[model samples]
Target: DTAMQLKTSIGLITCRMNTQNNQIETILVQKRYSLAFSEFIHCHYSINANQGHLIKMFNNMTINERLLVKTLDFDRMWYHIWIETPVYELYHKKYQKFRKNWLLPDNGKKLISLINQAKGSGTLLWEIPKGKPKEDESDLTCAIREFEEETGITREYYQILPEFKKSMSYFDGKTEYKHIYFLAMLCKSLEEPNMNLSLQYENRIAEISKISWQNMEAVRFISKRQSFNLEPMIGPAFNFIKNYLRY
Candidate 1:
């Protein structure tokens, strides 16, 4: 009986150790995944913001680093702000350097198709859908579904823009909304958009055109967070570049 008891205890311990090992590995992977994306997306934002100080981003110390970020405590439209020229520079250098010009997917979708983004008071904040679930679907999948449901775009056609391409800008101050912006490439057509697509937009809307880096800088932003003039809707996105592309 004593020998049997010892064997049982050892087996349990071994099972626990193996389970713990796998869990630890999973945690590390998740952390790395989150940090890597966060770094890449903000690499430009962090570097290009703050009166060009962000341009010299690597030079800051731990304490002075706090100064690098510009905050917006008050206002309605854009409460948080960051200069965009630097971010744009980094983006072109890192992602668009080799290929700055790519033809639009559409034949020329009537100027541009406006994407519908959702913002909330607290109901269900920003969640990036990964894919369609058997029933519940992931965030990335949900985003695409939501876009299609709101807009007339088909699943295969809508340009699933990468992260930051579909941004979010919340802080309207009135009721408070979380916004999601997507860049859908619809083939040019003679007809106008249903107009029912947007319940949030009031003054200006998304357009199809060429926005110069110089122009992006020259455009006056209404608030600090409005630096991109795109709202937070430009930060998070409906698109994700495929992993196979890397291979």
Candidate 2:
């Protein structure tokens, strides 16, 4: 039924108006959501469709243009924000009651060793964990990549806590910034944390140009503040996190 209907439709169009073989083929081949309507009227199509007159012919049938029309989306970005956590630390705080030693020659013993090493260091709500998008990457992708690259936390050990749907916005006196905050939880074990804070400290200078300089310096300062005691740095910012356990 569909094929016969399509053939009948093509025959009707062919009879009502004449077209070159290539133009007919292009029209028949056109499918839903294939190309924008204006593409057919563009001067480039005039040369391809054999005659300049073909341009007027295409306009005769408005329904045909609608059938072949497509839509496009545009995204101009300033940057993105990442809220991430160290995996071993999160897991240790929540599951410390279940803590036990690994048996000799146990499976997954390597992962267990790494978890133990980080246990005493305690879990921290990272103040400086953030990422900006690369030219090709999305905000969420940048968040995941930047967190692991900067904090040495791996994807396997962390997850986005989507229940809250928490996001924020601010202006750095120049650009309006959209900040999406994810409550990331880290679980499972890792071999070792990269702990490349020094590299991030250097890169902070570069981040200041786009964001505010003093704000970034404050973020870096919070890391030191956290190391001393979480009492000052870990207050209202963490209100949305329901399961947070103090270490």
Candidate 3:
């Protein structure tokens, strides 16, 4: 028996991987298929104080970094090339969709699924978890605390993966993001598991659906570009097991 959950969003995104470095190069490359240029806002969207200069810093560099630029695109409907929209405009588009008057502080994110611990080890995915204020702690710190509170293990070894990045809701002034992903390797076993462990195990035991990767190669394939509709794991959980787990 199998059961799990997945995070959901209305964005089209993708990535290509570089296996040698174990780094997945990412780009906000969601090319609009039939989107009209005029239908999009002005290019000033990404323009904020120091925002352009911040982009200019990378213009001279040939490194794998972020970039913001203005270029013309061929508008299919108009059959003519036009200057691209600004970054501020794109930010506004996303922001408008995410913000709402009635949304709670925890509105944009939630627990989407429990990737069965029995199959893939301990891996789960949720909507972008709520952000903590700068005053108290970091999101990873909170995640550690939450896990420990539930599992009795203090997560000491981990890093937020660079590829898994996103910013909060810019339109609503709430920068809700889905970018903060974690890679954790336990230092020691927990004295007590999370309270939800039993229910989680029960869900798996009751059985709805499950997927398995018996070999390392399959794990690698899923790590870099496991599509959104398929599952919540962002490629690494599978690939890490492939690289670290030995039969």
Candidate 4:
């Protein structure tokens, strides 16, 4: 009985030690990947962002200590990193460059749309004005500026809503690393959109032509019910904006 008891105790201790050994090795592999990811960031965005600072911090860590902090904030890092990568190459080919914009209406009563954008897509959807931000320009300021340039309505008439601070990402035929979707409170505006609003520099003509009730062929003011019938991805965004504004 004494000998049997001794064997069981030894077996339990051995099992525990082996389990701990495997865990440590798994951790080692993960740390090495973290080191590699940080290295990748350093190579691409050397001076463009704070990546250089991040790299220095990573390199300063001891091997064993590195794993816990390796790629500490990887998800967000990956988000920004991919923007400066090949993903953006395909993205720009489709839509030029990083663009930001907001969705609102000339009047709070209904949403705006252009005839060109809704054609054949078979949906009642509204689109926002998007453009690249200026050097050192903030996102809020950029959106406001682009919206005014395209629609001739300034930011004073619109209020950024807290409910819909959303972004979308996907890659199918055309690439969209990230789509900044901002929802805002819009009131009636008297200013008319610039007639020559077509893309002047490597730009595409406004997908929307005009707002007309008589000619669905030219343009139409869309309603909440109509917006729900939009393309699967777009419908939710439309409703999100509508519901927020409506209430």
User: For model 2, which pairs clash?
Assistant: none
Write one digit per residue (lDDT tens) for candidate 3, span 83-154.
Answer: 233445555554353233112434422101110111111122112112232445665555445333332233
Question: Tens-digit lDDT track for model 2 on 59-97?
Answer: 332442322221110010001111122344543432332
**lDDT at residue 141 of model 3 (Cα atoms):** 59
How well does each candidate superpose onto the true structure, as a TM-score? 0.23, 0.31, 0.25, 0.33
Identify the superior model by TM-score, candidate 1 or candidate 3. Answer: 3
Candidate 1: C-alpha RMSD to true structure equals: 24.7
Q: How many clashing residue pairs, candidate 2?
A: 0
lDDT of 3: 0.29
For residues 91-131, could you state the per-residue lDDT of candidate 1 as single tens digits? 44543421221113343221112111111111111122212
| Superposed model 3: Cα runs more than 4 Å off | 1-136, 156-176, 187-234, 245-247
lDDT order of candidates, top first: 4, 2, 3, 1
Task: Give candidate 4 misplaced runs (Cα > 4 Å).
Answer: 1-127, 172-176, 190-234, 241-247
User: What TM-score would candidate 3 get against the native?
Assistant: 0.25
lDDT of 4 at 82: 43
Candidate 3 all-Cα RMSD? 20.1
| Candidate of highest TM-score | 4
Q: Write the per-residue lDDT of candidate 4 for residues 1-247, one digit (tens) a residue.
A: 1222110000000000113322100000001123333443343223244534534434443343233323333334444324334464544432221111101223211111221112121222343444566778876666566655544455566566545545544443443344454555444332323343444521223333331111121112333333221133334444564455357
